[PDB]
Structures are given as structure tokens and as C-alpha cells.
Design a protein around this motif. Structure first.
Motif, mmCIF file in Angstrom:
data_model
loop_
_atom_site.group_PDB
_atom_site.id
_atom_site.type_symbol
_atom_site.label_atom_id
_atom_site.label_comp_id
_atom_site.label_asym_id
_atom_site.label_seq_id
_atom_site.Cartn_x
_atom_site.Cartn_y
_atom_site.Cartn_z
ATOM 1 N N UNK A 1 0.820 -1.206 0.000
ATOM 2 C CA UNK A 1 0.000 0.000 0.000
ATOM 3 C C UNK A 1 0.855 1.257 0.000
ATOM 4 N N UNK B 1 0.811 4.067 -2.943
ATOM 5 C CA UNK B 1 0.508 5.481 -2.743
ATOM 6 C C UNK B 1 1.631 6.366 -3.254
ATOM 7 N N UNK C 1 3.694 8.716 3.557
ATOM 8 C CA UNK C 1 3.745 8.010 4.828
ATOM 9 C C UNK C 1 2.640 8.441 5.779
ATOM 10 N N UNK D 1 -0.518 8.267 5.432
ATOM 11 C CA UNK D 1 -1.781 7.605 5.161
ATOM 12 C C UNK D 1 -1.705 6.095 5.318
ATOM 13 N N UNK D 2 -0.568 5.552 5.743
ATOM 14 C CA UNK D 2 -0.487 4.116 5.925
ATOM 15 C C UNK D 2 -1.022 3.728 7.299
ATOM 16 N N UNK D 3 -1.375 2.454 7.430
ATOM 17 C CA UNK D 3 -1.878 1.900 8.678
ATOM 18 C C UNK D 3 -1.211 0.550 8.895
ATOM 19 N N UNK D 4 -1.645 -0.154 9.933
ATOM 20 C CA UNK D 4 -1.166 -1.496 10.218
ATOM 21 C C UNK D 4 -2.328 -2.462 10.056
ATOM 22 N N UNK D 5 -2.117 -3.487 9.234
ATOM 23 C CA UNK D 5 -3.213 -4.332 8.776
ATOM 24 C C UNK D 5 -3.860 -5.113 9.914
ATOM 25 N N UNK E 1 -4.775 -3.885 3.109
ATOM 26 C CA UNK E 1 -4.507 -3.429 1.742
ATOM 27 C C UNK E 1 -4.504 -4.590 0.767
ATOM 28 N N UNK F 1 -0.213 4.986 15.044
ATOM 29 C CA UNK F 1 0.791 6.039 14.947
ATOM 30 C C UNK F 1 1.101 6.622 16.320
#
Ligand SMILES: [Mg+2]
Ligand SMILES: [Mg+2]
Lengths: 23, 68, 545
Positions: free
Chosen positions: B3, B7, B47, B49-53, C428, C545
Motif C-alpha cells: 500500500x 501510494x 507516509x 496515510x499508511x496503517x497497520x493491517x 490493503x 501512529x
């Protein structure tokens, strides 16, 4: 003289039901 | 990881297309983009807009399954 | 017909033309190489792609004998007469000259011989097998077959010696549709304004006959524009580009004709606020479909999925309607619980069918409303129906990410309970960006109010800044309710004024009094509990975060 014949009879399916529990 | 790299590529194509549109406009009034390569700034501003799945709960459940 | 009629499949034209002509023009060369050429071929693909057109072209161009067999034509009533007909056909073809057999719709005459329960059909397929291979199988003849479901053929028939080579006549590409359009517009008279390149770009899923239908409809529109007979009108028809635009805006691909959506008319200016989200959606939908060269330049596939989540009525379905109406890609609007069925496996069968249509008529956008209805957590339900919901969510997982091609499927999900979604969907690759749609702020509420009041007359002095400052926790639905109440009070005033007038135009605007006294019952739909729940969900997403 002989003769042929066609035939289509039926089919059978299986259903799915929902159950209710009391915890 | 897929992802984040996607992006970054999306921001890069945005930069390329806006540069091409500006070039076409100034031609109206060769290289296709200012840089064909993805820049460090694309990673820098992709960076946010990323998350942890997987949540920690799912990770803990998998760890317990491995232990047992 | 000829080789200038069949368009959009260069590989298949060349393969079939060489296979049919070269062994019947230079047999000595194939005696020099030593081996015999392939002699049986099965053309397969979606309907309306050009299989029968190709057969007609081969029959017209090649000077050899040609024998045509429609599927059911072979069967007859007297016992053992169908096999006699097949033997007679093969003997007639072989005896006179080297010949080409063409069997149209082989699915009618070549079942799987394992699920069938008849007798005559199984003997007809066995007779076909013996004729195609065995002692004195066939000499100087070639066999072409056409089908829509290659999987409905017994595998024993599709081995070397019977049908060795499989040509896949599938959906065209943009260049293929342009070539087909150029073929189909070679005989009519066109005005200079027509530009076929743009038209082919916007025909996103049309295959073969679809293009012909489009052309016919455009021509008919032109015929009914200049018919409101002398040669003055017989000449100078001039199919304008507007005719083509109208016919394209009216027709849809035959593949999606099963699931054609009702024509809802909204526009982007109808969506107030959420400008950045609107631009993000534009960016994620239009870039892969219009600019593939840059994506292949970077060597990455595009992002596909997206999930809206937020309080009810914030505008999720409104965004979906805007996408459906103002985007060139095809739209499949699918309900949440519509796809379930009482039978065993029919839910997953329907899901597979829907995604097959989506991947067939690509580029396509599929809207999953209330994703939490069919895609919930797995195994939570103790008392279930045999885990049917579990199988449904697993089917979705594999269909959205599996042994597929990843050509162009854009999934948008819309649910207001993002905690009930299976975490395997949020990763994702399936739904890779989660867009929160928060409650509008003052500058968004004013925009919304203008958006729904753009077709309404208002008093010139009516400023909406006070209304925006006065609604604080409201949503788009709440603003809609306010305007509806004001309009209803205006209607009441008009009706009573008309009654007074006929007792023995009264109101052309919504008055400030109408708005003020319709604002008495204004109410905020979303409670603080739900707002805190969504805020906590967002803060938990950001807690990573
Ligand atoms: Mg056909
Ligand atoms: Mg909705």
C-alpha cells in the motif's frame, strides 16, 4: 419401424435453515 | 508495504500528469516528466496515510495458537 | 464478408487463416516438415464476439467445400437416425473434395457424458468421437467448432486428434473497438464532426455486436431527427456526433444488460463539502482507466478498493450515486443482503456471477452498500445456518484477492459500523484506503445548503450564513429535513392563498419566515454517543501512529 422418445422428470434440491439459541 | 509503495506511485503519477499539463499549456501559449524516477519526497508525503493491517488482538491470538 | 469484416482480433484471424489455408495451399511443405497440421479447433468466448462471423468469412473466402452443422439439426425421431445423419454428413464432406466442417453451438451435441442421463445424446457423442478418431478417422478435411461454454464439453472430445488447438476469441481492447467502429462506419455517410477515437475510449465494455447496435441506434436517432419522400431529405442525412453521444448515453453493454441500474440523475455539484474526498475519489478512479502508460512505466498495478465509514447520512450513498452517474466506467450497484439465498451454495454462486460480470465488462465499479451485512466477523455466530455467512465472507475474500487477473475492478464499500467488518477485508489489497466521512463544518453546511437549493427560488435578501452558524451538530440529512420543512410550509401558504383567491402567482419564493418557522423542529440526528464512538474508532486507527 422403431422410434425414440425424450423424457425429463424432475430434480431434488437441499435447503438451509436458521436456528435460535438461548445463550 | 504494497500500500505504501502504491501510494507513492500514485503521487508520482500525479506529479507527472500535472507537469505534462503545464508543459502542454505553456507550449500552447522530449522528457515526459521532470523526473521519471520516484523521488524521496513521494515517500516522505505518502507516509501520512499508511496503517497497520492486523491489530494487536489478532497478533496475540496467532501467537497463542503458535504456542499451543 | 471477408478478412476486412472481422476486426479487433489479429492473432485469432491469423491463426485460423493459416491453419485453414496453408495446409490446403501448400500440402507439399507439410509433407516436407513431416507432421500433419492441427485439424480441429474450438472457438470459444462470450457471445457476440465474432465466432460465427469468422466462420462466415472463412466459408466465403476459402474456395474449398464447406459443410455447416447447427447443433440440434442432427437429431431425429426414428431410432439411430442422428448417427446416420452424422455419418452421412462426414461421408458427403469427405467424398467430393477437401472440405471444412463447421459445427455451430457444439454445447448442444457434446455434453459431458457424465452428468447427462439420456441415451440418444450419449450415443451421438460416442459416434462423434469415433468419426473424429479411429480406424479411417478423416482425410483432407478440417473441423471448426464454436461454443459459448467450453467447460460444458466432455474432456475426452477435447484431446489431440479431435480438437487440438483452442482459439480464445475474447473481449476486444480499445484499439480493437476502434477498428471495429471503423469497419462498421465504412458504409454509412458521416459528418466531419465525428471522432471515433474518443468514442472508442468511452466504450468501456462493448464487444462486437454491441458496437453494431450502437451504430444502428445512432443512425435511427438521426432518422427520427430529420423526419418531422423527396430526395432533398433522402440525401444529406449526416449522422452527427450528437447522435453517437445520445446512443452511447442510452445503450449499455449486453453483459451488464442483466444488471442495468436505474437511471438516477445526480451530479458532483450536488455533493456539498467533502471537496478533498471528492478529488481523492476522482484521482483513484480516473487515473488507472485513462493513463495506463504511466502505471506501466513505474511497473505497479493501481489501487482499487475503498471503504467509506461514518455517521448515517453523511453522504456515502450520495458519493456512490455521483460515481455511478459521472464516471465513464461501468457501474454495478449491489445490495447487501440481496445476494443471499435459501439454497446451499447459491449465495456464493451469485457472488461469483456478479464478480464475473464485473471482470468481464472491465473497467468496472462495484458498490457494496452496508458491507457489514454480508461481511461480518467469522465464527462469532454460535447458532448459525451451517456457516453460510462464513462461506460468503470467505468467497468474497478469495474473489477480491485470489488466483484472479487484477485487471480493473473498483470496489467501494459503505458501512456505518466499521467495527463489525472482518479484519481480513480491511487489509490493503482488498479495501486499501479507509475514508472517514465526518460531520460537516460550517463551510461544508453552507455548501450543502447551496447544493440542495440550486434549483430553488429564494428571497434575494435571504442569507444562509445564519442557518449555517445555527446548525452545529447537524448532518446533510438534517439540512435536507430543514429545507423540506421550509418548502412544505411554503406549499401550505400557496394552497391557502389559492383557496382565498378562488373563494370569490401568490408566492414565488421561500420566505425568511418560512425558513425561521420551519427551523423550530430542527433536530440533530446523530447523538453524542455515536459521535464519540466514531471519534474513538478514528483515534484507535491513529493509535498505530
Ligand atoms: Mg455466432
Ligand atoms: Mg446509505
Amino acid at each position: 419401424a422403431a422410434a425414440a422418445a425424450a423424457a425429463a422428470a424432475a430434480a431434488a434440491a437441499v435447503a438451509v435453515a436458521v436456528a435460535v439459541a438461548a445463550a | 508495504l504494497l500500500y505504501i509503495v502504491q501510494r507513492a506511485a500514485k503521487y508520482a503519477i500525479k506529479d507527472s500528469i500535472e507537469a505534462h499539463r503545464q508543459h502542454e499549456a505553456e507550449k500552447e501559449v522530449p522528457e515526459v516528466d521532470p523526473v521519471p524516477y520516484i523521488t524521496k519526497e513521494h515517500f516522505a508525503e505518502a507516509m501520512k496515510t499508511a496503517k497497520r493491517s492486523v491489530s494487536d488482538a489478532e497478533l496475540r491470538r496467532y501467537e497463542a495458537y503458535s504456542q499451543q | 464478408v471477408g478478412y476486412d469484416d472481422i476486426g479487433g482480433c489479429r492473432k485469432q484471424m491469423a491463426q485460423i487463416r493459416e491453419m485453414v489455408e496453408l495446409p490446403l495451399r501448400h500440402p507439399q511443405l507439410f509433407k516436407a516438415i513431416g507432421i500433419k497440421p492441427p485439424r480441429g479447433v474450438l472457438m470459444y468466448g462470450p457471445p457476440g464476439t465474432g465466432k460465427t462471423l469468422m466462420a462466415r468469412a472463412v466459408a466465403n473466402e476459402t474456395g474449398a467445400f464447406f459443410f455447416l452443422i447447427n447443433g440440434p439439426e442432427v437429431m431425429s425421431k426414428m431410432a439411430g437416425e442422428s448417427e446416420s445423419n452424422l455419418r452421412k454428413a462426414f461421408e458427403e464432406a469427405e467424398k467430393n473434395a477437401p472440405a471444412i466442417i463447421f459445427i455451430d453451438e457444439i454445447d448442444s451435441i457434446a455434453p459431458k457424458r457424465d452428468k447427462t442421463n439420456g441415451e440418444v445424446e450419449r450415443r451421438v457423442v460416442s459416434q462423434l468421437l469415433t468419426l473424429m478418431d479411429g480406424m479411417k478417422a478423416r482425410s483432407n478435411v478440417v473441423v471448426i467448432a464454436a461454443t459459448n461454454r467450453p467447460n460444458s464439453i466432455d474432456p475426452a472430445l477435447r484431446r489431440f486428434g479431435r480438437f487440438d488447438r483452442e482459439v480464445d476469441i475474447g473481449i476486444p481492447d480499445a484499439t480493437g473497438r476502434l477498428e471495429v467502429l471503423r469497419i462498421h462506419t465504412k458504409n454509412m455517410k458521416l459528418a466531419d464532426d465525428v471522432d471515433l477515437e474518443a468514442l472508442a475510449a468511452e466504450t468501456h465494455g462493448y464487444v462486437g455486436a454491441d458496437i453494431a447496435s450502437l451504430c444502428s441506434e445512432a443512425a435511427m436517432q438521426q432518422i427520427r431527427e430529420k423526419m418531422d419522400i423527396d430526395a432533398e431529405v433522402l440525401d444529406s442525412l449526416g449522422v452527427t456526433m450528437d447522435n453517437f453521444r445520445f446512443a452511447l448515453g442510452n445503450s449499455n453493454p449486453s453483459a451488464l444488460r442483466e444488471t442495468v441500474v436505474e437511471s438516477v440523475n445526480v451530479t458532483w455539484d450536488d455533493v456539498g463539502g467533502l471537496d478533498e474526498i471528492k478529488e481523492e475519489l476522482k484521482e483513484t478512479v480516473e487515473y488507472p482507466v485513462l493513463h495506463p502508460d504511466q502505471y506501466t512505466k513505474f511497473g505497479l498495478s493501481p489501487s482499487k478498493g475503498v471503504l467509506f465509514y461514518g455517521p448515517p447520512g453523511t453522504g456515502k450513498t450520495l458519493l456512490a450515486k455521483a460515481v455511478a452517474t459521472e464516471v465513464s466506467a461501468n457501474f454495478i450497484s449491489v445490495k447487501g443482503p440481496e445476494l443471499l439465498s435459501m439454497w446451499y451454495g447459491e449465495s456464493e454462486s451469485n457472488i461469483r456471477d456478479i464478480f464475473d460480470k464485473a471482470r468481464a465488462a472491465a473497467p468496472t465499479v462495484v458498490f457494496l452498500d452496508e458491507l457489514d451485512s454480508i461481511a461480518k466477523a467469522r465464527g462469532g455466530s454460535l447458532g448459525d445456518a451451517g456457516g453460510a455467512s462464513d462461506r460468503v465472507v470467505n468467497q468474497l475474500l478469495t474473489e477480491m484477492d485470489g488466483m484472479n487477473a487484477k485487471k480493473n475492478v473498483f470496489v467501494i464499500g459503505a458501512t456505518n459500523r466499521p467495527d463489525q467488518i472482518d479484519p481480513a477485508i480491511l487489509r490493503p489489497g482488498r479495501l486499501d484506503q479507509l475514508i472517514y466521512v465526518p460531520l460537516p463544518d460550517e463551510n461544508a453546511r453552507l455548501s450543502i445548503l447551496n447544493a440542495q437549493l440550486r434549483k430553488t427560488p429564494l428571497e434575494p435578501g435571504l442569507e444562509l450564513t445564519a442557518i449555517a452558524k445555527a446548525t452545529q451538530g447537524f448532518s446533510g440529512a438534517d439540512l435536507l429535513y430543514i429545507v423540506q420543512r421550509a418548502a412544505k410550509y411554503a406549499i401550505k401558504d400557496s394552497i391557502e392563498a389559492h383557496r382565498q383567491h378562488e373563494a370569490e402567482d401568490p408566492v414565488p419564493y421561500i420566505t425568511k419566515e418560512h425558513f425561521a418557522e420551519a427551523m423550530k423542529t430542527a433536530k440533530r440526528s446523530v447523538s453524542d454517543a455515536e459521535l464519540r464512538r466514531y471519534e474513538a474508532y478514528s483515534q484507535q486507527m491513529k493509535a498505530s501512529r
